[PDB]
Amino acid sequence: AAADERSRKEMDRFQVEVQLGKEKSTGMSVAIKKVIQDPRFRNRELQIMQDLAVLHHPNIVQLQSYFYTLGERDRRDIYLNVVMEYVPDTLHRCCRNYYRRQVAPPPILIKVFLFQLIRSIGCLHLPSVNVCHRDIKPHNVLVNEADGTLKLCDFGSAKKLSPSEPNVAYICSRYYRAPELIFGNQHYTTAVDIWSVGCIFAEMMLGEPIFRGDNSAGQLHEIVRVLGCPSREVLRKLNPSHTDVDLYNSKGIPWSNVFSDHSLKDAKEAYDLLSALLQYLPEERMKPYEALCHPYFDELHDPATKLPNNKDLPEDLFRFLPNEIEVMSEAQKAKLV
Amino acid sequence: AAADERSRKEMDRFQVTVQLGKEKSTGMSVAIKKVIQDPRFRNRELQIMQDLAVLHHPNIVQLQSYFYTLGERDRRDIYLNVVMEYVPDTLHRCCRNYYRRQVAPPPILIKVFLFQLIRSIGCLHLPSVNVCHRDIKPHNVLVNEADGTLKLCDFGSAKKLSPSEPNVAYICSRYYRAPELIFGNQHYTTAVDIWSVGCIFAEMMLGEPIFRGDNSAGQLHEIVRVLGCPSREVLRKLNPSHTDVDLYNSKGIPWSNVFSDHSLKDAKEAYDLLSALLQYLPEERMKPYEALCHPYFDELHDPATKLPNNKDLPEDLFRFLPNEIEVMSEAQKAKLV
């Protein structure tokens, strides 16, 4: 198994039940991702996780350790094993448990979860940090339902994007894939994560994915079917070779008909925020710290606001790291800090 | 760097990301493809070429030899080397040479080339052979203008398809991908090659690829732009989750407007045949042995018809293997044999 004395030491720090287990020491639950080491390459996930660990964000899962081990089909091969803090409940499971009983998760949970998801990408997207997750989805969001807390996980598709280097599109799970990724742009921005988060929002309020393509063509279909035909500007910028507006022909479906079986007291606020996140044009998608100040979240500031079991809102909800505060506008610092 | 004595002996029959050389023995030009051997797996391509070599169809390249060599990046790794007959001109090069000079290829050449290309897939698709090439494009067709012959090559992406085992799509080069492949059907038929051939026919008359998508969605966009909105049946049968026809608000473009710049006037027979092959529904695409009887090929039956260089038409143009004659209908046998 172990390929190193250091790796053997780190392995013995944990007990196993991706592999799930617990830190024998502190009792903390952990998951172990195992990925091949290629002599030619260094692993991005590890470095990303190590950069993030220095910040220790309340809404991002924390690296515990890494260690190496040999292969089975070939003992020549070395495998990196990354160990992250973990919890068994995902946003997907959490939401599915309500919808399976023909009800929806409490509005305030939906609201507190979203605020924290927006928070996770706010920090990731900082110039200082510059991590693009590239596969934000309900299976990759961990939640504590009772505490109202939430953490972004699985950076196995993450990359720090740069202008000077091009990128693939297929790493993002299809239903959560931004339009620029559907069009196969080798260069895109962290706005692909904003799209993903807008798709989860819709998903929390619908009980299924909003854009469920059986394929790339189908994925575009489902987006166009709801958001309507994209503008000339959009197609010209994101899909220059195929700008024929009559082959993207729909008026769209308003949010009121999308969310027909489920009601919110502040539907117009939620739909505003949802629309701002699901803008076709990347630079026009609302950026995390602006989203956190949107009216949909106003009630989270009210000290009378509590969780569905009448418990207080999570401690850290408004505990922002200096890193974040430094980049905020004055108006954002006024509202959030 | 042979892997055994058989491989050393075979390697020395010939002299030199493929490798071009000649068979010392007969002077015959050859191509040498090398592909990794994996111990878990058998190579489909070799077995396919070995099966086809038995038939020795005049329009399929013929396997000459196979040998194994050890790696350079790793001497532990064995590589299969497949040696097949080769000629310097691809159908792609041949047409490029005309369209380079703002000139269309000779109509009789296009005609005689299509007959033979349609002939090859007719053989591949016999139930007794049941080979699907899966990447028919002009780079994979070899021609000799001097005698008018054509050979289908590069069975690198080929497979004997069956309903018991699902298949991938990405193997077929994008521009030549049938609609069922763009939709990601895991199960499809040999008709995916009838489409590819249809795409090459159109390319022979246009001087560039007919459907040029920058992405999977874009590839459908370009097909729809020309063929018009697919029927509800088409979407029902190939893309069951995305059947809203309103999104594809296109009447198509007639072939006479597509091939504007190199107007022919045996055109109505050619456009009729093109439309017969480029059908959305796989099952509706004209089958090779029917396509060979189309009126467009009537000229090839006249002993007075000649290649542009005044040489007789290919000797084996109407020499069909018994393999083929047993499958033919009486109407087909009547016109062809």
Per-residue tokens: B150: 């054509």
Q: Which chain B residues are Cβ-neighbours of A242 within 8 angstroms?
A: 213-214, 217-218, 221-222
Q: Which chain A residues are Cβ-neighbours of B242 within 8 angstroms?
A: 213-214, 217-218, 221-222
State how far the Cα of B241 lies from the Cα of A120, in Å rounded to an integer.
Answer: 33
Whether residue A183 and residue B214 make contact (CB cut-off 8 A), yes or no, is yes
Whether residue A242 and residue B213 make contact (CB cut-off 8 A), yes or no, is yes
Q: Is A2 helix (H, G, I), strand (E, B) or coil?
A: strand
What string of DSSP letters covers A201-221? HHHHHHSS-SS--SSHHHHHH
Which member of A183, A214, A221 has the closest CB to residue B215?
A: A183
Per-residue tokens: A108: 């305030």
Return the H-helix or E-strand segment holding B64: strand B63-70
Query: Which residues, 6+ apart, have CB-to-CB distance to A38 below 8 Å?
Result: none
CA A317, A319, A325, A328: dihedral to nearest 10 degrees? 20
Put simply, whether A242 touches B (Cβ < 8 Å) is yes
Find the residue in A nearest to B224 (Cα): A247
| Interface test mutation site (partner A, options B216, B235, B244, max chain A beta carbons within 10 A) | B216
Residue B263 CB burial class (10 angstroms; 0-12, 13-18, ≥19): exposed
State how far the Cα of B243 lies from the Cα of B236, in Å rounded to an integer.
Answer: 6
Which member of A218, A242, A244 has the closest CB to residue B239?
A: A218
Put simply, whether A217 touches B (Cβ < 8 Å) is yes
Which member of B183, B225, B248 has the closest CB to residue A215?
A: B183
* Cross-strand bridge partners of residue B2: B69
Put simply, whether B244 touches A (Cβ < 8 Å) is yes
Whether residue B215 and residue A182 make contact (CB cut-off 8 A), yes or no, is yes
Active site residue B272: no
Put simply, whether B330 touches A (Cβ < 8 Å) is no
Put simply, whether A213 touches B (Cβ < 8 Å) is yes
Asked if A204 contacts A105 with a C-beta cutoff of 8 angstroms, the reply is yes
State how far the Cα of A85 lies from the Cα of A79, in Å rounded to an integer.
Answer: 20
State how far the Cα of A250 lies from the Cα of A271, in Å rounded to an integer.
Answer: 19
Residue that has been written with the tokens 């993207």 in this structure: A248
Whether residue A217 and residue B214 make contact (CB cut-off 8 A), yes or no, is no
Put simply, whether B228 touches A (Cβ < 8 Å) is no
Q: Which chain A residues are Cβ-neighbours of B221 within 8 angstroms?
A: 242, 244, 247
Cα atoms in the 13 Å half-sphere on the side-chain side of B209? 17
Residue type (1 letter), A315:
E
Put simply, whether A221 touches B (Cβ < 8 Å) is yes
- In residues, how long is chain A? 337
Put simply, whether A218 touches B (Cβ < 8 Å) is yes
Q: Which chain B residues are Cβ-neighbours of A213 within 8 angstroms?
A: 241-242
Q: How many CB pairs under 8 A join A and B?
A: 83
Q: Which chain A residues are Cβ-neighbours of B182 within 8 angstroms?
A: 215, 217
| Interface test mutation site (partner B, options A243, A245, A249, A280, max chain B beta carbons within 10 A) | A249
State how far the Cα of A51 lies from the Cα of A55, in Å rounded to an integer.
Answer: 7
Q: Which chain A residues are Cβ-neighbours of B248 within 8 angstroms?
A: 247, 249
Which technique was used to obtain these atomic coordinates?
X-ray
CATH superfamily, region A89-337: Transferase(Phosphotransferase) domain 1 (1.10.510.10)
Put simply, whether B241 touches A (Cβ < 8 Å) is yes
Residue that has been written with the tokens 């994008």 in this structure: B174
* Cross-strand bridge partners of residue B33: B82
Asked if B320 contacts B337 with a C-beta cutoff of 8 angstroms, the reply is yes
Residue type (1 letter), B210:
I
Residue that has been written with the tokens 């990196």 in this structure: A80
Instruction: Spell out where chain A has E strands.
Output: 14-16, 19-23, 29-36, 63-70, 78-85, 141-144, 149-152
Residue that has been written with the tokens 């991590």 in this structure: A131
Asked if B198 contacts B285 with a C-beta cutoff of 8 angstroms, the reply is yes
CA–CA–CA angle A185, A188, A192 (5° rounding): 110
Q: Which among A122, A145, A12, A113 is positioned nearest to A57, based on CA atoms?
A: A122
Which member of A183, A240, A244 has the closest CB to residue B217?
A: A183
Query: Which residues, 6+ apart, have CB-to-CB distance to A185 below 8 Å?
Result: A169, A238
What is the dotted CATH code of the domain comprising A11-88?
3.30.200.20
Put simply, whether A244 touches B (Cβ < 8 Å) is yes
The single residue of B89, B135, B147, B272 carrying the catalytic annotation is B135
What are the start-end ranges of the H helices in B148-227? 179-182, 191-206, 216-227
Matching fold, domains B11-88 and B89-337: no
* Cross-strand bridge partners of residue B310: none
The domain spans of chain A are 11-88, 89-337
State how far the Cα of A212 lies from the Cα of A221, in Å rounded to an integer.
Answer: 9
Q: Which among A293, A318, A283, A326 is positioned nearest to A127, based on CA atoms?
A: A326
